[PDB]
Chains A and B, each alone.
Chain A
Amino acid sequence: TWYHEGPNSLKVARLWIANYSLPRAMKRLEEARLHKEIPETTRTSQMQELHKSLRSLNNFCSQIGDDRPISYCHFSPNSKMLATACWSGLCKLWSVPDCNLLHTLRGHNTNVGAIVFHPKVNLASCAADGSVKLWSLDSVADIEGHTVRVARVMWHPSGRFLGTTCYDRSWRLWDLEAQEEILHQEGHSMGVYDIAFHQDGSLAGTGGLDAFGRVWDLRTGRCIMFLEGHLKEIYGINFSPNGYHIATGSGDNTCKVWDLRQRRCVYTIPAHQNLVTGVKFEPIHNFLLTGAYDNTAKIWTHPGWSPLKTLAGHEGKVMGLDISSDGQLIATCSYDRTFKLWM
């Protein structure tokens, strides 16, 4: 084990993060609340919402995209447009109606990892070629340094920084503006299949193919708490909006949910058969939504973690899914090649 020196310029950023990060927590606590209690509303209201979510939803339409399965779909912060990535292609679609779409582009890359929106005109996409592309969506630059395929990419909650996580045991922290390598990080011993950023913008948790969920403090660059629970590769790492809980998924058909703040260890939802691809929490406001190759799609409480409901409209396996910010949409990319809007 070594401490590596260097990169003062990045050092500057850590300060920025600290100022930004530190100020965020008080607001998060205010959002959390507690004082009102009045349990009846919650149990009636929260329960009612969960029941509705897991009890009515259905297909609206299917749609098509390409002839390769669809590897990533993402909704914009206004939830009006979807981006769909094929093994080799993507196009941007209109949330409500879908159908015709706006317009397609065949990017220079052949097999698409993940696609993400800037929180505030831009997207970002990672793929097989080891090159991340900053897109301007009209009514920007390429990122270099990665040898292998890049599985996941995310925008810091802040807004300034992009972090990339690929296959060669390197998750790389990147700036949007300058397109520079702010941090080259090591520490897993095989592939690293996801990187997640947690809502105060303090911490990133890395899932890997070595079944070790490994937390990381961006500001000190210190490996913090290693999580062991998954006896197969950990595909998705989904952070929670509250910011004190994380959730993971894996080849083993399990979802672990670890809360560092409450010292709650891990509560395992036994979710799915046949893998898990992408777990998603509900952004605004509790619910979990996940996708495996079982063809079903699930709905979970964040309090009991009892499975509530499941929905089957896919004929094939599901690579990835994203859910409406209000929570009136659910968009799931079918393994076969459609994009299915869930009510």
Chain B
Amino acid sequence: LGVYLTKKEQKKLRRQTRREAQKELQEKVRLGLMPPPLKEDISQGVHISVYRVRNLSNPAKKFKIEANAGQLYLTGVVVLHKVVVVEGGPKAQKKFKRLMLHRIKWDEQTSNTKGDDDEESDNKCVLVWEGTAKDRSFGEMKFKQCPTENMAREHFKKHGAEHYWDL
């Protein structure tokens, strides 16, 4: 919240500010003092988000998602085939949401390293839901890989989260 003030309240302030200073200096010459010139989030509930993408292959993307999750105290997980989930205080999620959508470019091209050498690689992201949950059973943020679409559910299944995946 901010107050402004008018032209005449600038003068009066500027002059009464200046006056005190110069007269105080004046005495100093008379007196001879002066030669003469924490991860954030909310405990009661838990804000959450969920994201869904075609490819995660780029490592630079794989790495950021591990850092920021550990950087901001976001609980959650990530999965894929051969979705992303995040939970915390509402300030945390907003940062992370900004990252996933507006900062990071998932459509961008990268040259990956394989066991033999380096090769080129030439995907989109969109949010599904943000909301509120009785408790977040996620203990830590654990990126993983699943071969099928089923153990992928059983993975979330452990967390009673089967539903968060959308075909």
Contacts and interface: CB of A to CB of B under 8 A. Distances in A.
Contacts of B133: 229, 266, 268
A231 interface: yes
A304 B90 CA distance: 27
A230 B166 contact: no
Nearest to A232: B132
Contact of A230 (B50, B127, B132): B132
A338 interface: no
A256 B131 CA distance: 9
Interface in B123-167: 127-134, 163-164, 166
Contact of B129 (A250, A271, A304): A271
B28 to A, nearest CB: 59
B98 to A, nearest CB: 15
B34 interface: no
A305 B44 CA distance: 25
How many A residues are at the interface, by size bracket? Answer: 20 to 34
Interface in A217-261: 228-232, 250, 252-254, 256
B83 to A, nearest CB: 12
Given A230-B45, A231-B47, A252 B163 contact: no
Choose among B45, B130, B132, B133 the residue with the greatest number of A CB atoms under 10 Å from its CB.
B132
Given A231-B42, A304-B163, A270 B134 contact: no
Most chain A beta-carbon neighbours within 10 Å: one of B44, B46, B134, B166:
B134
A270 B129 contact: yes
A273 B128 CA distance: 8
A306 B164 CA distance: 9
A61 interface: no
Given A267-B163, A306-B163, A229 B127 contact: no
Interface of A: 211, 228-232, 250, 252-254, 256, 265-273, 304-307
Interface of B: 42, 44-47, 50, 90, 127-134, 163-164, 166
